PDB file of C-alpha atoms and ligand atoms in Angstrom:
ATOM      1  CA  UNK A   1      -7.533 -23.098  -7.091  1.00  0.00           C
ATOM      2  CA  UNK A   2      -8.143 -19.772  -7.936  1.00  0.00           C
ATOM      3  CA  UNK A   3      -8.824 -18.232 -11.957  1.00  0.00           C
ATOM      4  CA  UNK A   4      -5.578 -16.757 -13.194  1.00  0.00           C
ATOM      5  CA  UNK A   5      -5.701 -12.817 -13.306  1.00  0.00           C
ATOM      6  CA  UNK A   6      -4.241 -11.371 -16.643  1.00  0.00           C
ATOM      7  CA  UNK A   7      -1.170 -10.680 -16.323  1.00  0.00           C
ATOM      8  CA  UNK A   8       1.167  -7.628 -15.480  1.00  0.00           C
ATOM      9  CA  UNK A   9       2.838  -6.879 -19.082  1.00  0.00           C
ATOM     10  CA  UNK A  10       6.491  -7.180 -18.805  1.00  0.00           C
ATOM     11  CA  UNK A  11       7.486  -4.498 -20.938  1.00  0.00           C
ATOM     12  CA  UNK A  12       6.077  -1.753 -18.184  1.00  0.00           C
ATOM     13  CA  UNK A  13       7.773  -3.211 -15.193  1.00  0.00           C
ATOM     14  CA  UNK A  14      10.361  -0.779 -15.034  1.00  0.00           C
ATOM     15  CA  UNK A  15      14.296  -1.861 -15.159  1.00  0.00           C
ATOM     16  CA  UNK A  16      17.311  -1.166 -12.820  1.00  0.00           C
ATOM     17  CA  UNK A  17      14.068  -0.676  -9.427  1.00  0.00           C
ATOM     18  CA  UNK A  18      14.378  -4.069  -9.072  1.00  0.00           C
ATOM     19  CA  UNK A  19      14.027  -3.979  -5.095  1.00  0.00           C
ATOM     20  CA  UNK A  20      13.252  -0.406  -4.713  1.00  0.00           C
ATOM     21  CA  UNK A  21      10.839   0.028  -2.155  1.00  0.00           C
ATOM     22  CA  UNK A  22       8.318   1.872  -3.561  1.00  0.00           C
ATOM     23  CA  UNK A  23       4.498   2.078  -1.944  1.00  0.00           C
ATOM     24  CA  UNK A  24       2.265   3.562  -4.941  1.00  0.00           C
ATOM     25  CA  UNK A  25      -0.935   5.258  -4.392  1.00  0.00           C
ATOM     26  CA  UNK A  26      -3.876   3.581  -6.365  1.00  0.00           C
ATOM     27  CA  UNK A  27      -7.173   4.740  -7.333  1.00  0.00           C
ATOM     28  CA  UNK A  28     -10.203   3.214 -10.047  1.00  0.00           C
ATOM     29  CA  UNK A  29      -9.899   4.590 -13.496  1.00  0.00           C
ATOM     30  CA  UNK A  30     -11.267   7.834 -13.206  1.00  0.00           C
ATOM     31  CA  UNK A  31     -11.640   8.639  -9.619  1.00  0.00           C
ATOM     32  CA  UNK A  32     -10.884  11.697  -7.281  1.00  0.00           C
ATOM     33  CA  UNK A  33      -8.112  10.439  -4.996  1.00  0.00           C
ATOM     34  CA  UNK A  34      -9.101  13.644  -2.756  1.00  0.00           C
ATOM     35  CA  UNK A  35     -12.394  11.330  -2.197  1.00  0.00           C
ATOM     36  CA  UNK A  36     -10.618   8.239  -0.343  1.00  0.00           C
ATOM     37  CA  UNK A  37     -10.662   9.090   2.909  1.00  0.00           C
ATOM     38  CA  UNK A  38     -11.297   6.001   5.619  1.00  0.00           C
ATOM     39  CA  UNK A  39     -14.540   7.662   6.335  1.00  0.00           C
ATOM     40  CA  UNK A  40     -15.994   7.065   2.649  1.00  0.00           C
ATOM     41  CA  UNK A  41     -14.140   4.024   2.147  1.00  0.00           C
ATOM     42  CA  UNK A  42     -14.546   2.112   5.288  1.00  0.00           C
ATOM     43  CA  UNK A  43     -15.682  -2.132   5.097  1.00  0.00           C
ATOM     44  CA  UNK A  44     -18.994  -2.777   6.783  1.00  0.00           C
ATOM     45  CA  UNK A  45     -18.434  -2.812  10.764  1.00  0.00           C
ATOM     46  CA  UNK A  46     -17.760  -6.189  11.314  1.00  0.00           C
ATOM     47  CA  UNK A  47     -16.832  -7.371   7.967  1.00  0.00           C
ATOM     48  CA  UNK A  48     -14.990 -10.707   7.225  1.00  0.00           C
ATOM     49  CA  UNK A  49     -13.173  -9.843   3.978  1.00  0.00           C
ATOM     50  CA  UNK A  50     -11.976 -12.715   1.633  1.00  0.00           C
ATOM     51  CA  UNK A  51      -8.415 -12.870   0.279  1.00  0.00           C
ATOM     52  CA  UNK A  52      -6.969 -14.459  -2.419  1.00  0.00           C
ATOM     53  CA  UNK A  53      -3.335 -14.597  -2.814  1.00  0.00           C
ATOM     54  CA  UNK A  54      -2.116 -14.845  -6.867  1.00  0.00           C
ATOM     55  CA  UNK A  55       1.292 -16.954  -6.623  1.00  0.00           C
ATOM     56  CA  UNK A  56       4.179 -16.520  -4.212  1.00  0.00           C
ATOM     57  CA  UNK A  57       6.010 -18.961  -2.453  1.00  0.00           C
ATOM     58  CA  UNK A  58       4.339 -20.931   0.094  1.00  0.00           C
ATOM     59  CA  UNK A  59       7.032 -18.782   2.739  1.00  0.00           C
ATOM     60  CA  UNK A  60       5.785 -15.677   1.119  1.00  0.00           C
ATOM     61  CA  UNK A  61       2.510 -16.243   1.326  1.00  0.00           C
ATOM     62  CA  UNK A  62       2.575 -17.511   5.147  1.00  0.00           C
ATOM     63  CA  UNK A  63       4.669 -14.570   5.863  1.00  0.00           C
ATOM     64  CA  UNK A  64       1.236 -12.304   4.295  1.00  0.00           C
ATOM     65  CA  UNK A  65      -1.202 -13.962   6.033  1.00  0.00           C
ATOM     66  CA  UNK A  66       0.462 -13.980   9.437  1.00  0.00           C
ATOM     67  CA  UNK A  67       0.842 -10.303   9.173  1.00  0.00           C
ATOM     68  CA  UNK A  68      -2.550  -9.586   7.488  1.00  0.00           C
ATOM     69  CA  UNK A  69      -4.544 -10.769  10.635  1.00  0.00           C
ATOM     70  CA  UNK A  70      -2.409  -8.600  12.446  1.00  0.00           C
ATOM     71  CA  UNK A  71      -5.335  -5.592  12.330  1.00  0.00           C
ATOM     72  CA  UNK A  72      -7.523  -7.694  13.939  1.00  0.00           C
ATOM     73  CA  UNK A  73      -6.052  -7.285  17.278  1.00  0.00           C
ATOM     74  CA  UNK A  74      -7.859  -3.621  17.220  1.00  0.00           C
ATOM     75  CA  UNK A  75     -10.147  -3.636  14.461  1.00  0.00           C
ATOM     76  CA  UNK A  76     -13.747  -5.550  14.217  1.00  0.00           C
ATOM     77  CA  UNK A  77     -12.837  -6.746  10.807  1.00  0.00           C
ATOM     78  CA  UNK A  78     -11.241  -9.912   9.708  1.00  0.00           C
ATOM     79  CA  UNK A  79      -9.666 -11.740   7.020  1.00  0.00           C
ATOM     80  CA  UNK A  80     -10.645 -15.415   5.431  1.00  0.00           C
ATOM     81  CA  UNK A  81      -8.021 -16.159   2.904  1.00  0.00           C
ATOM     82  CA  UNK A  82      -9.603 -18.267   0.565  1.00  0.00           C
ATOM     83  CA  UNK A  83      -8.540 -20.298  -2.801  1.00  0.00           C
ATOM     84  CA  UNK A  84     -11.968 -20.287  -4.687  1.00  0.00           C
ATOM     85  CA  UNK A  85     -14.743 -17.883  -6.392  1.00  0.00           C
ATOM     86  CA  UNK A  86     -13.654 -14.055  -6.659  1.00  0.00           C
ATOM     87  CA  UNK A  87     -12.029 -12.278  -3.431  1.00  0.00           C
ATOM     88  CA  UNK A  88     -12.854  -8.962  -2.557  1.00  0.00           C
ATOM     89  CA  UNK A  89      -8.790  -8.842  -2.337  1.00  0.00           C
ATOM     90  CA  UNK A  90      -6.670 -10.011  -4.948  1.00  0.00           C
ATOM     91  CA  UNK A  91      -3.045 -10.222  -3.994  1.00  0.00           C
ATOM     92  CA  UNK A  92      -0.280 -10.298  -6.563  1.00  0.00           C
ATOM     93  CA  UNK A  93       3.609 -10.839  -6.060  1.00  0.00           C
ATOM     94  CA  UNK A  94       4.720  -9.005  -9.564  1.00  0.00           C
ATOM     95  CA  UNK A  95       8.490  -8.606  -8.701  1.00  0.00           C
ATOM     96  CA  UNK A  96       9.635  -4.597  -9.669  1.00  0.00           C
ATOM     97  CA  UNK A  97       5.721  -3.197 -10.194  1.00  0.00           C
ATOM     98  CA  UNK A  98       6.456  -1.481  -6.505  1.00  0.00           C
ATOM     99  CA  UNK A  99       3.933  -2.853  -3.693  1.00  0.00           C
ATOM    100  CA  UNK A 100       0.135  -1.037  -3.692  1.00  0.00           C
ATOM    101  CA  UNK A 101      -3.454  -1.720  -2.505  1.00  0.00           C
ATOM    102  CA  UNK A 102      -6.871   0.063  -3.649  1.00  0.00           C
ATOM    103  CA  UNK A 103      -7.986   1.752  -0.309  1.00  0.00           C
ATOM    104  CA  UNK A 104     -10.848   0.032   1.576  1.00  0.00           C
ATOM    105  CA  UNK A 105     -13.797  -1.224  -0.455  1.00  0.00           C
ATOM    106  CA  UNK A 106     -12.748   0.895  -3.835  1.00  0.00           C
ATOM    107  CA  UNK A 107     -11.142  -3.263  -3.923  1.00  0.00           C
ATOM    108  CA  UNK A 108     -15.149  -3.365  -5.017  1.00  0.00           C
ATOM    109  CA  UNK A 109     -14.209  -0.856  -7.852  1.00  0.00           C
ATOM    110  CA  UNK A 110     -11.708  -3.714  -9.435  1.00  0.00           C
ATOM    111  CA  UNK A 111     -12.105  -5.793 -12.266  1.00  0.00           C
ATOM    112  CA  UNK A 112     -12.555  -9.466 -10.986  1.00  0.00           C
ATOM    113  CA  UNK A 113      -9.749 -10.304 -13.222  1.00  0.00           C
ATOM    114  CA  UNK A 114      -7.081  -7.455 -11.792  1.00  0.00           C
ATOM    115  CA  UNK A 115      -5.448  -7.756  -8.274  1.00  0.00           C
ATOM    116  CA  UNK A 116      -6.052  -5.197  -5.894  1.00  0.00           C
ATOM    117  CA  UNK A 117      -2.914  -5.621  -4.316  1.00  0.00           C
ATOM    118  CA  UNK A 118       0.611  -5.971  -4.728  1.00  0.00           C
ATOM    119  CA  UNK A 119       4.077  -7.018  -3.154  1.00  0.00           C
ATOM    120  CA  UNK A 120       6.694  -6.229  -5.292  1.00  0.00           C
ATOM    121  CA  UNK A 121       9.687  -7.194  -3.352  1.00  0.00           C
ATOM    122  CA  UNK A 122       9.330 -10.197  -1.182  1.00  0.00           C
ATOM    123  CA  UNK A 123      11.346 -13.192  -1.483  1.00  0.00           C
ATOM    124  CA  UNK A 124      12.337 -16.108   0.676  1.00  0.00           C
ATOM    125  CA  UNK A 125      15.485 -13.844   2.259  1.00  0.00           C
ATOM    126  CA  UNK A 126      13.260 -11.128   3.580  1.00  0.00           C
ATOM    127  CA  UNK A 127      13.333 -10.207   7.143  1.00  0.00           C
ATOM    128  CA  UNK A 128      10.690 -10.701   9.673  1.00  0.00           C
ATOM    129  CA  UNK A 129      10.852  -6.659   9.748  1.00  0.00           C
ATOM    130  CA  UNK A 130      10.322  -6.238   6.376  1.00  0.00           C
ATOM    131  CA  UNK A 131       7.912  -7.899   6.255  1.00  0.00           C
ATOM    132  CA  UNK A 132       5.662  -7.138   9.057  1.00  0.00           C
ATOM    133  CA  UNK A 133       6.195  -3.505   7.904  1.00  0.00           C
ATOM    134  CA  UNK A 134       5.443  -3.664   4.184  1.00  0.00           C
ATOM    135  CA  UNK A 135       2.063  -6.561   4.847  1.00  0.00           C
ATOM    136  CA  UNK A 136       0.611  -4.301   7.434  1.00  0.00           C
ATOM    137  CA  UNK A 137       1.103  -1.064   5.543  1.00  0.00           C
ATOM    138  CA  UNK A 138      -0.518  -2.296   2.590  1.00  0.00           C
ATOM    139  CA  UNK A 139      -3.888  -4.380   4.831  1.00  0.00           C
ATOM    140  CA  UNK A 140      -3.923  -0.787   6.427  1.00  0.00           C
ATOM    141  CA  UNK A 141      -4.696   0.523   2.851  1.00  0.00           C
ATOM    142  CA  UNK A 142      -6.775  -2.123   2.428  1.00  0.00           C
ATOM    143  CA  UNK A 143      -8.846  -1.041   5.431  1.00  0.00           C
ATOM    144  CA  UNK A 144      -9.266   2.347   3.814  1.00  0.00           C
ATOM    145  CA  UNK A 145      -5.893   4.137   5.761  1.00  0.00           C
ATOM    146  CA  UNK A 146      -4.170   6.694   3.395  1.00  0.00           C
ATOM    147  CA  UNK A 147      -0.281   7.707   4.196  1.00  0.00           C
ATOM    148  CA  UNK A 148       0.728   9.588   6.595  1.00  0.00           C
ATOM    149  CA  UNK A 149       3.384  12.110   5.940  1.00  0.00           C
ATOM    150  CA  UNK A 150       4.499  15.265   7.544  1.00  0.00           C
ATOM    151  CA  UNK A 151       5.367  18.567   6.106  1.00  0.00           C
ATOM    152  CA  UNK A 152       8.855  19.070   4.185  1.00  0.00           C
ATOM    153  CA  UNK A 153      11.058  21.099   6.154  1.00  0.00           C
ATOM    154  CA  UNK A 154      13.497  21.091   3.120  1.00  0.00           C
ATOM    155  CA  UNK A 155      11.757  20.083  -0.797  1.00  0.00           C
ATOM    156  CA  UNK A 156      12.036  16.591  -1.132  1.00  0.00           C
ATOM    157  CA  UNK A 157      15.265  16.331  -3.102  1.00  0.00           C
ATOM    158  CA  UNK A 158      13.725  14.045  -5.584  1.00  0.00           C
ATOM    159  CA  UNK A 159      15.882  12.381  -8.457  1.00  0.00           C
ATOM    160  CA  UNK A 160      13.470  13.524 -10.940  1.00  0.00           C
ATOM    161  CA  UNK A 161      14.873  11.404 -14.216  1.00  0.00           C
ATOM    162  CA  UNK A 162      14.531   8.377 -12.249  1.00  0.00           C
ATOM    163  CA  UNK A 163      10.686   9.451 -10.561  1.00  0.00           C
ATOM    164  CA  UNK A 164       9.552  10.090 -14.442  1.00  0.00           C
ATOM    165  CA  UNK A 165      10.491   6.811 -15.536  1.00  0.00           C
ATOM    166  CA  UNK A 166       9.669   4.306 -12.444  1.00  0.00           C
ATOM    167  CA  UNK A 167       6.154   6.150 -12.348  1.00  0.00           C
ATOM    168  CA  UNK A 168       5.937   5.626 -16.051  1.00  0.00           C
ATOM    169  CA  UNK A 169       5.703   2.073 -15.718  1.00  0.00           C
ATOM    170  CA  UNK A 170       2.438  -0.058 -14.643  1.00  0.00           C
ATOM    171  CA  UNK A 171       0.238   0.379 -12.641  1.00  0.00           C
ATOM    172  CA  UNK A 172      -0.304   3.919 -12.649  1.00  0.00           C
ATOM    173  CA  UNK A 173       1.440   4.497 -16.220  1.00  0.00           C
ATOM    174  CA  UNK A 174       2.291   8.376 -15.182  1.00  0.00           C
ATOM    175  CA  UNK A 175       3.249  11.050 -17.772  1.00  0.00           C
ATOM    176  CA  UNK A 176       5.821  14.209 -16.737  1.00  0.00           C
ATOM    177  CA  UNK A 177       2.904  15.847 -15.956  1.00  0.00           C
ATOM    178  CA  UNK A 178       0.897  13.381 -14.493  1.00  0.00           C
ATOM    179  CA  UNK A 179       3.954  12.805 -11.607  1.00  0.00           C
ATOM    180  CA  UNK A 180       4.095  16.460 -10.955  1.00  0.00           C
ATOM    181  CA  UNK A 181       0.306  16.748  -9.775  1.00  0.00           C
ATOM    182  CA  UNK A 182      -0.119  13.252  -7.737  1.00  0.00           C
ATOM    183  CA  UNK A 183       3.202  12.763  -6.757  1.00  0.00           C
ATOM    184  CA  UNK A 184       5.394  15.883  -6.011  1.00  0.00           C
ATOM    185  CA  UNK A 185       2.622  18.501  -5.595  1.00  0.00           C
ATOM    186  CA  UNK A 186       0.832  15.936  -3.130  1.00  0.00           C
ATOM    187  CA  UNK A 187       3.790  14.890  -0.412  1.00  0.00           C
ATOM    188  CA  UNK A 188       4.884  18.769  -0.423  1.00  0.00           C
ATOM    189  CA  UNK A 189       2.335  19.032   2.083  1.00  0.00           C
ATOM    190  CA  UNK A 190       0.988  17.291   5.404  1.00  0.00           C
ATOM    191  CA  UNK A 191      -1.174  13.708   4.531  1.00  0.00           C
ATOM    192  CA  UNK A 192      -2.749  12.605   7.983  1.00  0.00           C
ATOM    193  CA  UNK A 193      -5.756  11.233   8.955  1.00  0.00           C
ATOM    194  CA  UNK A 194      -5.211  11.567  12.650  1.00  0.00           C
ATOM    195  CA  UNK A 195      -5.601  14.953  14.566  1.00  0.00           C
ATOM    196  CA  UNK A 196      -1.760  14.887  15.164  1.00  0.00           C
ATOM    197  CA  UNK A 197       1.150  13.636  13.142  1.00  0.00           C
ATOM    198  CA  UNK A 198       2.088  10.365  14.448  1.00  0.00           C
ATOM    199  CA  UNK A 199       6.332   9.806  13.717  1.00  0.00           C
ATOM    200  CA  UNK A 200       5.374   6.275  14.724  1.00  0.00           C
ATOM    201  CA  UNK A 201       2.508   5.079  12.461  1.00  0.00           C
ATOM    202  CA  UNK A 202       2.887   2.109   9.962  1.00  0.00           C
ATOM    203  CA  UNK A 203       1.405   4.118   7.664  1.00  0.00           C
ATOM    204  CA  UNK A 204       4.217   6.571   7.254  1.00  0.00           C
ATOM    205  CA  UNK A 205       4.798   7.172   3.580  1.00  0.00           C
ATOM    206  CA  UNK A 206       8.596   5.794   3.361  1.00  0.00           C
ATOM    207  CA  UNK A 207      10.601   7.731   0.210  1.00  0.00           C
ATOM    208  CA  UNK A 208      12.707   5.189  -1.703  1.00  0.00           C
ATOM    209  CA  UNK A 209      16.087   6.186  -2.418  1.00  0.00           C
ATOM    210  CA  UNK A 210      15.894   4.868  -5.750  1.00  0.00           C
ATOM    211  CA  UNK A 211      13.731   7.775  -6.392  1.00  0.00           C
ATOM    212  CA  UNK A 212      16.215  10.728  -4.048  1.00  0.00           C
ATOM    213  CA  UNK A 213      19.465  11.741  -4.064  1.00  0.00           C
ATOM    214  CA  UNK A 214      20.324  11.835  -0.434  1.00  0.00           C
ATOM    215  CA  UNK A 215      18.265  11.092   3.096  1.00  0.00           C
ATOM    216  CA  UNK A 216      17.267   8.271   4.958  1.00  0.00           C
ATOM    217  CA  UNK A 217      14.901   5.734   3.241  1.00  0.00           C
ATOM    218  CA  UNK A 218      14.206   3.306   5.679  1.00  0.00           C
ATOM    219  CA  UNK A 219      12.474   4.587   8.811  1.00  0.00           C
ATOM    220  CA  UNK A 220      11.318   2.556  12.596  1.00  0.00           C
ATOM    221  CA  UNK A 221       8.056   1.867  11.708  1.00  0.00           C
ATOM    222  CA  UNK A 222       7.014  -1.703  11.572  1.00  0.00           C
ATOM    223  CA  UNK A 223       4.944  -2.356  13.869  1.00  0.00           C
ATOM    224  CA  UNK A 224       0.760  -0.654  14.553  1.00  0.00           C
ATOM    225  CA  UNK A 225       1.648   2.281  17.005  1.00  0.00           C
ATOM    226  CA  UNK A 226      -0.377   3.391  19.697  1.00  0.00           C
ATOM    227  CA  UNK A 227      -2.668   5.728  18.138  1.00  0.00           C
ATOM    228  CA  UNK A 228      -2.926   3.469  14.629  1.00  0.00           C
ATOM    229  CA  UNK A 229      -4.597   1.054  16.874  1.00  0.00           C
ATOM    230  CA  UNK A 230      -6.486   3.632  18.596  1.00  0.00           C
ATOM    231  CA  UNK A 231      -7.861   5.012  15.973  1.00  0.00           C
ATOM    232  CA  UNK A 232      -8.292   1.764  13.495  1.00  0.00           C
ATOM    233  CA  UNK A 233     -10.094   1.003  16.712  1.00  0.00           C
ATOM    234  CA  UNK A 234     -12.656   3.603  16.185  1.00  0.00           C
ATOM    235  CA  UNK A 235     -13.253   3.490  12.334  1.00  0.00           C
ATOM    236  CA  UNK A 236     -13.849  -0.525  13.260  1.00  0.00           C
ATOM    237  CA  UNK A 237     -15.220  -0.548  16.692  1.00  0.00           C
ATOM    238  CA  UNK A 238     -16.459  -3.931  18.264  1.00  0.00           C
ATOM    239  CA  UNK A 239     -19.902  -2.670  19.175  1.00  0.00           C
TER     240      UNK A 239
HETATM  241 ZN1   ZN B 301       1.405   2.893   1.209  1.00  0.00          ZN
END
């Protein structure tokens, strides 16, 4: 099969977020995340895109793949999971590291010996919904979507002792500061890349509450909407 990746250490998965739902943002060592935007991060038109899944149950894995291909409905691009050589996607199941993919081809950017995308709360019990949301978020990222995530009408009311430690942990290994410029300073404002907010996208940036101290976690979306398909239908057109 495939060659092992190293692993995550277990000393930085972070205890007691076991199962919270976190999506993290991800960027290369030393990148501009202001700079990943579909438009510069984009696959070739056309592209077939190899995957390699890193461990999981056989249900787990089915589960990723089913929903995975699910893009191609709209978008010219396609993926060939494959079990040999190095995949341009690397997908890890590290339970408790929060689920997170490298946006479009910055995959490229990874170390053939790192994933380039994680599920960190599967198991055999999870719901068809669950999973169809959390597998086509994170294949959106892979096809270079970022969140999308309307304006605050009241400040997040973020549990701020339990954001600096889960954000401590791997893979983004976040100091006090470090939270308060990506994290909190970035979803006080509007993150879209469509011309008007869509409440229905699967790319709505879901707040775990793990991480708050009141509101409601778990929103509709988990399924493409109408204008995610529209518009992954432009960035990838069959032409
Ligand atoms: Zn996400």
């Amino acid at each position: 099969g495939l060659k092992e990746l190293r692993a995550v250490p277990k000393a930085d998965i972070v205890s007691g977020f076991e199962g919270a739902k976190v999506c993290k943002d991800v960027y290369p060592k030393g990148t501009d995340p202001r700079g990943a935007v579909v438009r510069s991060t984009k696959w070739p038109n056309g592209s077939v895109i190899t995957v390699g899944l890193y461990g999981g149950t056989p249900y787990v894995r089915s589960k990723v793949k089913q929903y995975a291909q699910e893009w191609s409905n709209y978008a010219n691009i396609t993926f060939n999971f494959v079990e040999s050589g190095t995949p341009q996607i690397r997908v890890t199941f590290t339970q408790g590291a929060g689920s997170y993919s490298y946006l479009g081809t910055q995959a490229l950017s990874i170390p053939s010996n790192e994933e380039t995308m994680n599920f960190g709360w599967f198991d055999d019990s999870t719901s068809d919904t669950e999973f169809s949301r959390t597998v086509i978020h994170e294949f959106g990222h892979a096809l270079g979507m970022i969140h999308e995530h309307q304006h605050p009408l009241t400040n997040i009311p973020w549990d701020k002792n339990k954001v600096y430690a889960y954000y401590a942990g791997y893979p983004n290994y976040w100091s006090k500061k470090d939270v308060d410029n990506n994290l909190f300073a970035t979803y006080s404002t509007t993150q879209t890349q469509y011309s008007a907010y869509d409440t229905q996208s699967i790319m709505h940036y879901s707040i775990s509450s793990a991480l708050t101290t009141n509101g409601f976690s778990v929103g509709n979306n988990s399924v493409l909407s109408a204008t995610d398909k529209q518009f992954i239908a432009t960035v990838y057109p069959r032409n």
